[PDB]
Enzyme design. Structure first.
Site, short mmCIF file in Angstrom:
data_model
loop_
_atom_site.label_atom_id
_atom_site.label_comp_id
_atom_site.label_asym_id
_atom_site.label_seq_id
_atom_site.Cartn_x
_atom_site.Cartn_y
_atom_site.Cartn_z
N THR A 69 0.82 -1.34 -0.56
CA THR A 69 0.32 0.16 -0.30
C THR A 69 0.83 1.14 0.23
O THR A 69 0.41 1.65 -0.73
CB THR A 69 -0.75 -0.06 1.28
OG1 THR A 69 -2.03 -1.17 0.88
CG2 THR A 69 -1.73 0.96 1.14
N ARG A 94 -8.94 -0.10 5.94
CA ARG A 94 -9.61 0.27 4.36
C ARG A 94 -10.16 -0.75 3.76
O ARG A 94 -10.64 -0.84 2.96
CB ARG A 94 -7.58 0.15 3.73
CG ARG A 94 -6.74 0.95 4.70
CD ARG A 94 -5.40 1.34 4.10
NE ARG A 94 -3.86 2.15 4.02
CZ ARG A 94 -3.93 3.60 3.92
NH1 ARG A 94 -5.12 3.80 2.66
NH2 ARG A 94 -3.29 4.58 3.90
N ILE A 100 5.90 -3.43 10.65
CA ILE A 100 6.28 -3.34 8.60
C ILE A 100 5.68 -1.88 8.43
O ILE A 100 4.51 -1.57 8.78
CB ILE A 100 5.42 -4.47 7.78
CG1 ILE A 100 6.34 -5.48 7.74
CG2 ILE A 100 5.73 -4.31 6.38
CD1 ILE A 100 5.23 -6.61 7.64
N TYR A 135 -2.67 -9.23 6.04
CA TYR A 135 -2.24 -8.54 6.19
C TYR A 135 -4.00 -8.33 6.90
O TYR A 135 -4.52 -7.76 5.72
CB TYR A 135 -1.72 -7.12 5.25
CG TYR A 135 -1.93 -5.55 5.52
CD1 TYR A 135 -1.55 -5.22 6.49
CD2 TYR A 135 -0.97 -5.28 4.04
CE1 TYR A 135 -1.86 -3.69 6.38
CE2 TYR A 135 -1.00 -4.23 3.71
CZ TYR A 135 -1.67 -3.07 5.34
OH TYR A 135 -0.79 -2.17 5.51
N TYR A 143 -13.60 -3.59 -0.61
CA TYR A 143 -14.95 -3.36 -1.18
C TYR A 143 -15.79 -4.37 -1.23
O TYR A 143 -16.45 -3.69 -1.07
CB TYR A 143 -14.19 -2.64 -2.98
CG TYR A 143 -15.51 -1.73 -3.44
CD1 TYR A 143 -15.71 -0.62 -2.97
CD2 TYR A 143 -16.11 -3.41 -4.10
CE1 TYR A 143 -17.18 -0.39 -3.66
CE2 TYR A 143 -17.49 -2.44 -4.94
CZ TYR A 143 -17.75 -1.31 -4.88
OH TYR A 143 -18.45 -1.05 -5.08
N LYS A 176 0.89 -8.85 9.24
CA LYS A 176 0.94 -7.52 9.46
C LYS A 176 -0.41 -6.86 10.09
O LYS A 176 -1.34 -7.00 9.74
CB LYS A 176 1.50 -6.87 8.40
CG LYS A 176 1.74 -4.83 8.26
CD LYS A 176 2.03 -4.45 7.09
CE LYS A 176 1.96 -3.19 6.89
NZ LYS A 176 1.94 -2.66 5.57
#
Lengths: 293, 294, 293, 294
Positions: free
Chosen positions: C45, C139, C205, C134, C108, C163
């Site tokens: 990202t 998001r 990270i 992740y 999404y 992560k």
């Protein structure tokens, strides 16, 4: 059967020291009635119920009932996040002559659906007059599920409707389906009240109607007769005000508006505080848009 | 401008291996049109645009346009969270004969209003056909502010409207006030579409109209003719379905419904997966309530 | 096992036209290594994965693997909301020499826990090298449940860690407890990273390590040696920078900071855009507080 | 300055009729102390303050103060969404011998930052003893901004700290930076307390410490002397119970847990209600995991 149309969540006017201004209150209730309001709701959130004492709560309801002289229903607030306190408040509202009580979902302590059932059922058993459930997640965090609403209205003849302040209009449909066409649904959100009615609601327990009782009753009468052309034109006059009076924490904004119309002073009880001058200007623009100045 | 009423967010039928079922799709669009739908929207979210390739996206639009033959508007998906990809998709949709493109607010990368302006303006500058903004915070997280909407449709003639899937009906009012009565408002949420229309919407880019295109077309016509007693009756028939097709991640629900009506099979692309049996039963009962099964 | 310490979520420098600046990328990766970074993570990202093509994604990984020359682990981004695309992205990463892949939860399309299982299991069956999950609800909206993580790391020997970008530190405890002390937990949130190591994390990270590779390496080393007095003091230097590079949508902010240190130019790809001056001043103060200019 | 380590947010035992069980309460406080707790906090949220009368509120503090006999600080709850009410509660708390009060951000009425300033300043002026700010957006909806915290601690000597229930550990760092390292920072979230101490906290006003006062005190002393190896080890013992006592609405969970250790009965006042068997099982499992049952 009585509750439909525009029902005002009455402000409680305070004097310069923050004491109840009884004359301003009574004169305000008369005006609301002669302007054509279809109902009044004393001592709720907009009426500063959190900062009123038990004695004030009783007194305001008594004055409201006496001033109304049965010309319109009086749906008094009796909310608390304590079941035993809510019981006492509902009982007082009944003694003081209220036609129904408006009872919010407990806030802060975040009960579950079984907690909600125990809370509203204890109130229902303690009084004879009808109860409107006030579901407002934006303030109480929790939300009374439709299934819980169904259980309560089926188990208690005096639990007869909802003040739906979710502003999620799809709930109006689900509530109509599962609680019945007979379940009295009033919006608790001026900003979505028009759509709420389209989905099955029959009116709104309103904030904006404190200052625009005529327009509000007109908009809701338009909805009641299926004249959505007129309803949409009226909505457009009111929406900006509807929004403006929630820019800062209510009822600071609706009280300033009433004050601009000479209906009361602007004083509120901490932690509610005076508006900043920006918010004041925005309310002015909205009042002008509505034709009230 | 003439874009009003029930517009179906078309599912993309897959065969048993997950390949496009191009026959089933063309037959479905024809059925859609003969059932009275007022527009169709190929290769949007309900059409599984996230899992379609560029070549599939192109192809499905082509087939939709050839099948439709300008009988109703085709509003093709051209959404991406990459501006340069969204631009390219829109160009492909236009070249393939689309009447307009449906463009989602960028998702995952959470741009600000400036970012949104740059995104949509770059698209509008790249094509001649109209663009409908697809505001959907529940998926994109971000929300195009009304002032961004107004600015975009002021500065570009071909940005004309919104598919408002916020499900917050007050936005219909603010959009009407600040973007004008000219600005084309379509609901992106069947569960609040009725009320959305009351506040000023002129129709709905619908998921439920995949399987009830006649009822949905009728509901919205009722609203368009301002017959809200009829609209409410039709809403009560459709509402349980409207909810039921969103219990699990879309379009598993809507495709299952389509299956039960023989319109297509139930296969979806991962991470979209098959329904649980419990969801199938709720959707079954909802379809009987709507009278779609008899 | 070598995935511990500070691992930088690498930015992808672009030229004035927005094309990849390969020479700036390779020089930055060298600098990262020489400054003592414990690992690198290209094409995620922060590296503007959403706006890179497949060819660019492959190339950046290729250049990174070549530059790093096995001196630290390369954990390549291979994220998508399409399982088939994520599988292909992971296979390219593996073929390009990556030591592991970082795969985000689908965004999404909002899959359920079963969809998440299908998605990650598909990737795990397609590649040999390890996969780090992740999790970033802020998001993707959806959240991978701890049970699902636990299931994935039982059923696939190459799903080895997370992560965790939730910013909910309690999760590191539940993950530690149910996925095992062996499950590799790294923070995906610089702002809560110190606490996350306390609860059982073994590193981060990081976005901030793009411009502060040494200090971030020092802070996580402190944590890894269990020297939390020293880690807290290093945090005090880094926190303003950690917050500031998230005031506007990333990586506008981290890129501007790198630009200020001469590491690259500020160009980003739409819909990520240039910073306002207010933000740039705030980042400048943060860089100054850290002792970096 | 003596406000550090593990401080128990005391439950309030009720008998079978829901009346205050006073001997249970006094015996429980005594037990807390001898088990090594660092402070007690009566008539807060966990003590069911919303369902206590002012007279009960006063009595529970009087008892708690007398029982503690100055061995550890008593931080009495004095929360309300009405400023004039909180003021009167804080005065009774002080007049009853509390060493400090715990005052929650007003709930339900959603005041702005200036209303919060007015609320907390009025309380500070009405009493002499210190005030700890209870920031808990998950219940009050609103958040007290760090700048607001800073303004109040600057303008008032007796506002000295926060019970931070946000669960957002970055707030510890922001508050440490902007309010001072002298600003007293206690976690209000057992589930994130460990990391909260790492970012600058000096303790936790705790729910789990109701049933694990020793283990909790040990964990916070470990952090206080920067032995985070030990801290983590004790955190891994308690975390399951930390979650479990919040599966359902508090303090139903922690009181069941307390009843499983013979400390009180399970009775709570509506709208708080008894646990389901699924939660009771999970709480049992986590009690076994912490070694509190064998």
């Amino acid at each position: 059967s009585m509750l439909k149309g525009a029902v005002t969540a009455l402000i409680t006017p305070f004097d310069d020291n923050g004491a109840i201004d009884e004359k301003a209150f009574c004169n305000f209730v008369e005006w609301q009635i002669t302007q054509g309001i279809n109902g009044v709701s004393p001592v709720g959130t907009t009426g500063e119920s959190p900062t009123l004492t038990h004695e004030e709560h009783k007194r305001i309801i008594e004055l409201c009932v006496e001033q109304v002289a049965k010309r319109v229903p009086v749906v008094a607030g009796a909310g608390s996040n304590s079941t035993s306190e809510a019981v006492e408040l509902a009982k007082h509202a009944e003694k003081a002559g209220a036609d129904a009580v408006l009872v919010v979902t407990p806030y802060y302590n975040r009960p579950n659906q079984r907690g909600l059932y125990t809370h509203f059922s204890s109130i229902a058993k303690a009084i004879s007059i009808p109860i409107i459930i006030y579901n407002i997640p934006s303030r109480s965090v929790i939300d009374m599920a439709v299934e819980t609403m169904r259980d309560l209205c089926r188990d208690f003849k005096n639990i007869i409707g909802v003040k739906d302040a979710t502003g999620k209009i799809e709930r109006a449909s689900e509530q109509r389906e599962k609680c019945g066409k007979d379940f009295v649904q009033l919006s608790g959100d001026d900003c979505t009240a028009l759509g709420f009615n389209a989905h099955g609601g029959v009116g709104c327990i309103s904030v904006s109607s404190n200052v625009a009782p005529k327009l509000c009753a007109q908009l809701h009468a338009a909805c009641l007769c299926s004249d959505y052309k007129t309803a949409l034109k009226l909505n457009d006059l009111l929406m900006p005000l509807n929004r403006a009076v929630f820019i800062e924490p209510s009822p600071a904004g609706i009280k300033y508006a009433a004050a601009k119309l000479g209906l009361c002073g602007t004083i509120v009880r901490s932690p509610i505080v005076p508006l900043s001058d920006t918010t004041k200007k925005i309310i002015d623009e909205a009042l002008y848009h509505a034709g009230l100045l």
